[PDB]
């Protein structure tokens, strides 16, 4: 309850020091061994929602995946094995763009270069406006699939990057899938951003270890 | 302090804003930590770059200090002024 | 006479807000002007002229939950209204460059004066005047 | 039951909606009425 | 590896997203017909929705053009001001391509306005760039007529006024005031205001407000205006139904509950709810195939099971029993012989509901005859559905003359439940208005609701640590937290599970150490704390010491 908030000389050196290499070993062993079968069974059961996810994406509802545990592998498996091939074999090979929000070294201009190359026939918002005006006359067929891991990523958290991603979802011929880990993630988006994003919210918590994301921050600083 | 009736406008808080602006233009007031005019162009460039707290906080909550003390007020303000009696505490 | 009685220099229900937004603003004004000492004293069952102080997100959420009319809890709509408040320049932050709300060093403060929150409370029928 | 709980938590359209009477309840009602019907 | 890169592009019978119902007994033809019917109704709805949106945008653009080019013969050269209340950065304006006068749109984002110098430099840069396609200071404005032979008209679009430094804006306005000395320059100002004129009156100096106010216009372009367009959208949703589907009281109540939570962008949310409800109905209910009464011939015993489980049917059978109907009818319906209730169902499918026609009649009567427009059509439909229409009509005093005409009696037709939309399972809330915080907290505390030989005993470390986090104080000495977490662990079972692996030499090498348990506990604790930092649960006091942490969330709020 809320009353639990109102009703509320040792050092870390007293604990035995663990090196980074020693840190990796136990982490890997307990990630691979412990809770293997039940989590794999949960993943296999969760795969049953692939037709629903496909239908939602074709209707234009963006997918936001949240909950405790890593969501990179789930999105990779979905987008690679189910979404992209079926779109090609039912519309008649669809390119898929993967953005790593867990990397602080990203740049929005670099991603926009790939977007322009993949979408625009031969001041980012000015070009996005031209894309929107162009794709109005284009048929309502999915041409590019966009996957954005960690919409709460360090550089991704910034308002400009969120604005750039928000104007992307106006075009129906673009499929957007995003994931978040922060509990206060909805604080980032206002009504205008929510309207442009068109997320349908799905909790996909799986207690999957964040092995990849742990590489960009040093545990030795703790 | 006025006899009543047998059967001095308190100006609105919005109209006072012009008077408040005039009293800051004419250098009676100053900001709490107003550095003022910079000595050289290099420091002036940084001063024009950095935005202080006083440029963001609301109009009615900007702290000011006074350049004229009430003693000088009573010395200068004519005794015939209708607020002369309030020059002291 | 009516032309002279008013300056008419003004550029012209003053702020259309959802109930969640109104209660969030009410709680934020309490946070920005009430000492952290009195939170447990007043809200747990166990100043008009100074500049507002900063407050954390958890204090705002706790006071909002305590004053919202069984728990309301925090859904996506609550945080969406909170972000709308910031976008509307009703709540200020402690940052000016590269806005990132999730950075753990950013605090919040109220930009709405007393004369507006008074009428908001009147429209809500919430008696703030008895909390000070 | 486990599958229905995770379907409800996941917000899946595969989970049935409790607007109509459940199959088991109506089956029990039909069997109990029919057992004394003849 | 590609995982370390910021971003990268990956390249890889005919499927229909609808899944078989009746445990797979549904035929391909039935699935195809359901898919086609869904597409038909969905496209018919969008043909109205997109038309309404286009009409709204065209009307807004026409009004903007009228305001911009509403030429007024003012003797004094002054700015032209347009205040777009409740507007956003998404809107756009196209100017006239006049012959004698050149018109340029100038966008001014807050990032482009850190100081007056940068503002003027960028403004002149864009002004020069625009004139470069005809065939950085105010001297450019002075020399424009000699450089390009044409008059200059500038339209300034302040894209987001609230975030702009108002002192810098005031100085910039005073700077632009100097341009009136030129005989060939005209300036127009566009203000994207989110809330009201109050913020501008508070922040700008009262001298600049007088400069703006001499020639200004005020226009409310918000998406919500007296239910004018929401009522039309809802009526179009009723129309595209054609009486093939009905609305329940609970569904309309849910819609009304969620609409009031957003004040500026209600139309998109309403469209979201309607489209998702239509999708759910066409995905979940098998009887949607029988929307066309031609498809009734495809009935089967499994469909008779659904028909029998209709509440109306359930009480109709008991009514036959209690009214002493012949037992032959009861035996026939139990044994599903002679199926005359299928003929009754055909009649039901043919029977048009008078609710839609009466609602349209009442709406048009209010709009034209009673001349009442300040009403929500959703509330009117809800009161019609509950049957409390008289109370809703009593809101307006002019209804007394026509209360008899406007009165409507609801009818609970048999088998109507199979063709109604309602919120009964909570699916429409878990995905459209989730309790994002509460769901995560519950999963941390109630992991048994997610997860289906140490795996059988110990819960995932994150939830067990969240237990202590809920038990934890506001500020924590991290060493004590690690001690408690270590104490909660099953030390001997963990050691045995570690020793289970015979070939992982590096694991046994640490297992030989007496401090193995402490090190393993510390590694797990640090990984969990890093995850908490990613999730926003913990905040360090690193400036003083990394050894103390602060909680960032509490349960139940």
From Swiss-Prot, chain A:
Keywords of the record: DNA replication, Nucleus, Phosphoprotein
GO biological processes: DNA replication initiation; pre-replicative complex assembly involved in nuclear cell cycle DNA replication; silent mating-type cassette heterochromatin formation; subtelomeric heterochromatin formation
CC annotations in GO: chromosome, telomeric region; DNA replication preinitiation complex; nuclear origin of replication recognition complex; nuclear pre-replicative complex; nucleoplasm; nucleus
Primary location recorded for the protein, binned into one broad class: nucleus
Localisation: Nucleus
Recorded GO MF terms: chromatin binding; DNA replication origin binding
Similarity section: Belongs to the ORC2 family.
Additional record remark: Present with 1700 molecules/cell in log phase SD medium.
Subunit structure: Component of the origin recognition complex (ORC) composed of at least ORC1, ORC2, ORC3, ORC4, ORC5 and ORC6. Interacts with MCM10 and TAH11.
Described function: Component of the origin recognition complex (ORC) that binds origins of replication. It has a role in both chromosomal replication and mating type transcriptional silencing. Binds to the ARS consensus sequence (ACS) of origins of replication.
Name of the protein in question: Origin recognition complex subunit 2
Biological classification of the source: Eukaryota, Fungi, Dikarya, Ascomycota, Saccharomycotina
Span of the entire protein shown here: 242 to 498 of 620
Curated annotation (Swiss-Prot), chain C:
Gene Ontology terms describing biological process: DNA replication initiation; pre-replicative complex assembly involved in nuclear cell cycle DNA replication; regulation of DNA replication; silent mating-type cassette heterochromatin formation
GO MF entries: ATP binding; DNA replication origin binding
Assigned keywords, A-Z: ATP-binding, DNA replication, Nucleotide-binding, Nucleus
Gene Ontology cellular component terms for the protein in this record: Cul8-RING ubiquitin ligase complex; DNA replication preinitiation complex; nuclear origin of replication recognition complex; nuclear pre-replicative complex; nucleoplasm; nucleus
Localization: Nucleus
Note: Present with 768 molecules/cell in log phase SD medium.
Subunit structure: Component of the origin recognition complex (ORC) composed of at least ORC1, ORC2, ORC3, ORC4, ORC5 and ORC6. Interacts with ORC6. Component of a cullin-RING ligase (CRL)-like complex composed of at least the cullin RTT101, a linker protein MMS1, and the potential substrate receptor ORC5. Interacts with RTT101 and MMS1.
Family: Belongs to the ORC5 family.
Name the record gives this protein: Origin recognition complex subunit 5
Span covered, complete protein: 289 to 474 of 479
From Swiss-Prot, chain D:
SS bond partners: none
UniProt subcellular location: Nucleus
Domain of life according to the entry: Eukaryota
Miscellaneous comment as given in the Swiss-Prot or TrEMBL entry: Present with 2970 molecules/cell in log phase SD medium.
Role according to the record: Component of the origin recognition complex (ORC) that binds origins of replication. It has a role in both chromosomal replication and mating type transcriptional silencing. Binds to the ARS consensus sequence (ACS) of origins of replication.
Quaternary data: Component of the origin recognition complex (ORC) composed of at least ORC1, ORC2, ORC3, ORC4, ORC5 and ORC6. Interacts with ORC3, ORC5 and TAH11.
Similarity-based family: Belongs to the ORC6 family.
The name this protein goes by in its record: Origin recognition complex subunit 6
From Swiss-Prot, chain E:
GO biological process: DNA replication initiation; pre-replicative complex assembly involved in nuclear cell cycle DNA replication; silent mating-type cassette heterochromatin formation
Pfam families on file: ORC3_N, ORC_WH_C
Domain of life: Eukaryota
Any one annotated GO CC term: nuclear origin of replication recognition complex
InterPro entries found in the cross-reference section: EF_Hand_1_Ca_BS, ORC3, ORC3_N, ORC_WH_C
Molecular function via GO: chromatin binding; DNA replication origin binding
Localization: Nucleus
Keywords: Acetylation, DNA replication, DNA-binding, Nucleus
Subunit structure: Component of the origin recognition complex (ORC) composed of at least ORC1, ORC2, ORC3, ORC4, ORC5 and ORC6. Interacts with ORC6.
Family per record: Belongs to the ORC3 family.
Function: Component of the origin recognition complex (ORC) that binds origins of replication. It has a role in both chromosomal replication and mating type transcriptional silencing. Binds to the ARS consensus sequence (ACS) of origins of replication.
Name of the featured protein: Origin recognition complex subunit 3
UniProt source species: Saccharomyces cerevisiae (strain ATCC 204508 / S288c) (Baker's yeast)
């Amino acid at each position: 309850t809320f009353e639990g908030y109102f009703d509320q000389r040792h050092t870390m050196s007293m604990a035995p020091d663990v090196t980074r290499e020693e840190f990796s070993l136990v982490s890997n062993f307990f990630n691979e061994n412990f809770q293997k079968r039940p989590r794999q069974k949960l993943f296999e059961i969760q795969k049953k929602m692939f037709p629903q996810y496909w239908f939602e994406l074709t209707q234009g509802f963006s997918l936001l995946f949240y909950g405790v545990g890593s969501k990179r592998n789930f999105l990779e498996e979905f987008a690679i094995d189910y979404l992209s091939p079926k779109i090609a074999y039912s519309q008649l090979s669809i390119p898929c763009l993967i953005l790593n929000g867990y990397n602080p070294s990203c740049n929005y201009r670099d991603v926009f270069k790939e977007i322009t190359d993949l979408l625009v026939p031969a001041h980012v918002i000015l070009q996005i406006q031209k894309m929107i005006d162009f794709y109005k006359n284009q048929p309502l067929d999915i041409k590019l699939i966009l996957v954005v891991h960690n919409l709460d990523g360090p550089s991704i958290r910034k308002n400009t990057f969120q604005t750039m991603l928000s104007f992307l979802s106006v075009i129906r011929q673009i499929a957007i899938v995003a994931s978040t880990d922060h509990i206060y993630a909805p604080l980032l988006w206002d009504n205008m951003k929510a309207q442009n994003y068109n997320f349908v919210f799905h909790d996909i918590s799986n207690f999957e270890p964040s092995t990849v994301e742990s590489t960009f921050q040093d545990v030795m600083k703790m | 302090r006025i006899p009543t009736v047998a059967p001095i406008k308190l100006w609105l808080k919005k109209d006072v804003k012009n008077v408040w602006e005039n009293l800051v233009q004419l250098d009676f007031f100053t900001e709490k930590s107003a550095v003022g005019l910079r000595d050289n162009a290099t420091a002036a460039f940084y001063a024009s770059n950095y935005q202080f707290q006083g440029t963001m906080i609301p109009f009615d909550l900007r702290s000011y200090q006074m350049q004229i003390i009430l003693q000088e007020l009573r010395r200068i303000i004519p005794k015939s002024n209708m607020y002369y009696s309030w020059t002291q505490l | 006479i009516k032309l002279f009685l008013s300056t008419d220099d003004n550029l012209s229900q003053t702020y259309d807000l959802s109930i969640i937004s109104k209660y969030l603003l009410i709680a934020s004004y309490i946070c920005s002007y009430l000492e952290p000492r009195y939170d447990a004293s007043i809200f747990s069952r166990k100043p008009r002229y100074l500049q507002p102080s900063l407050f954390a997100i958890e204090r705002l959420l706790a006071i909002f939950q305590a004053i919202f009319p069984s728990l309301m809890k925090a859904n996506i709509e609550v945080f969406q209204n909170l972000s709308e408040l910031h976008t509307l320049k009703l709540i200020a932050t402690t940052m000016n460059k590269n806005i990132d709300y999730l950075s753990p060093k950013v605090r919040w403060k109220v930009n709405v004066p007393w004369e507006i929150i008074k009428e908001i409370s009147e429209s809500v029928h919430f008696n703030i005047s008895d909390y000070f | 039951r486990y599958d229905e709980i995770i379907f409800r938590k996941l917000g899946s359209m595969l989970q049935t909606t409790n607007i109509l009477v459940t199959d088991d309840q109506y089956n029990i009602w039909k069997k109990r009425i029919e057992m004394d019907l003849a | 590896a590609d995982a370390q890169r910021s971003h990268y592009t990956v390249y890889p019978d005919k499927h229909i997203p609808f899944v078989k119902l009746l445990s797979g007994k549904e035929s391909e033809v039935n699935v195809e017909k359901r898919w086609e019917l869904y597409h038909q109704l969905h496209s018919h709805f969008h043909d109205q929705v997109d038309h309404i949106i286009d009409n709204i945008e065209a009307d807004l653009k026409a009004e903007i053009s009228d305001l911009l080019y509403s030429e007024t013969t003012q003797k004094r050269r002054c700015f032209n001001t347009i205040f777009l209340l409740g507007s956003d950065s998404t809107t756009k304006i196209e100017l006239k391509d006049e012959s004698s006068r050149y018109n340029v749109l100038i966008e001014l984002t807050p990032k482009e306005s850190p100081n007056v110098r940068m503002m003027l430099r960028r403004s002149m840069y864009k002004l020069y760039s625009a004139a470069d396609a005809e065939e950085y200071d105010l001297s450019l404005v002075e020399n424009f007529k000699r450089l390009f032979g044409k008059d200059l008209a500038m339209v300034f679009n302040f894209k987001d006024v609230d975030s702009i430094n108002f002192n810098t804006l005031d100085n910039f306005i005073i700077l632009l005031k100097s341009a009136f000395k030129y005989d060939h320059v005209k300036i127009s100002l566009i203000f994207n205001i989110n809330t009201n004129l109050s913020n501008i009156e508070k922040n700008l100096r009262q001298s600049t407000i007088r400069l703006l106010k001499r020639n200004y216009h005020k226009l409310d372009v918000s998406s919500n205006k007296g239910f004018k367009y929401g009522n039309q959208i809802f009526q179009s949703f009723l129309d595209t139904v054609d009486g093939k589907l009905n609305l329940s009281d609970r569904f309309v109540e849910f819609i009304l509950s969620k609409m009031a939570n957003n004040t500026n962008h209600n139309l998109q949310l309403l469209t979201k709810m309607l489209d998702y409800s239509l999708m759910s109905y066409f995905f979940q209910n098998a009887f949607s195939v029988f929307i066309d009464p031609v498809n009734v011939d495809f009935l089967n015993d499994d469909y008779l099971k659904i028909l029998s489980r209709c509440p109306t049917f359930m009480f109709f059978v008991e009514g036959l029993i209690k009214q002493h109907a012949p037992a032959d009818e009861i035996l026939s319906l139990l044994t599903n012989k002679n199926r005359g209730l299928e003929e009754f169902f055909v009649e039901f499918l043919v029977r048009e509901n008078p609710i839609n026609g009466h609602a349209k009649f009442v709406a048009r009567f209010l709009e034209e005859e009673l001349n009442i427009t300040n009403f929500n059509l959703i509330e009117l439909y809800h009161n019609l559905l509950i049957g409390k229409l008289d109370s809703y009509l009593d809101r307006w005093s002019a209804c007394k003359e026509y209360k008899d005409r406007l009165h409507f009696e609801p009818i609970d037709t048999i088998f109507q439940e199979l063709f109604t939309l309602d919120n009964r399972s909570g699916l429409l809330t878990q995905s459209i208005f989730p309790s994002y915080k509460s769901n995560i907290e519950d999963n941390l505390l109630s992991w048994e609701q997610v997860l289906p030989d140490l795996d059988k005993i110990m819960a995932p470390v994150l939830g067990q640590l969240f237990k202590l986090y809920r038990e934890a104080n506001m500020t924590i000495n991290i060493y004590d937290f690690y001690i408690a977490f270590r104490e909660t662990l099953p030390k001997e079972e963990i050691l045995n599970f570690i020793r289970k692996d015979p070939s992982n030499t590096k694991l046994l090498e640490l297992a030989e150490t007496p401090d193995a348990f402490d090190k393993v506990a510390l590694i797990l604790f640090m990984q969990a704390i890093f995850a908490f930092e990613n999730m926003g649960l913990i905040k360090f006091q690193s400036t003083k010491s990394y050894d103390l942490v602060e909680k960032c969330v509490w349960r139940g709020i």
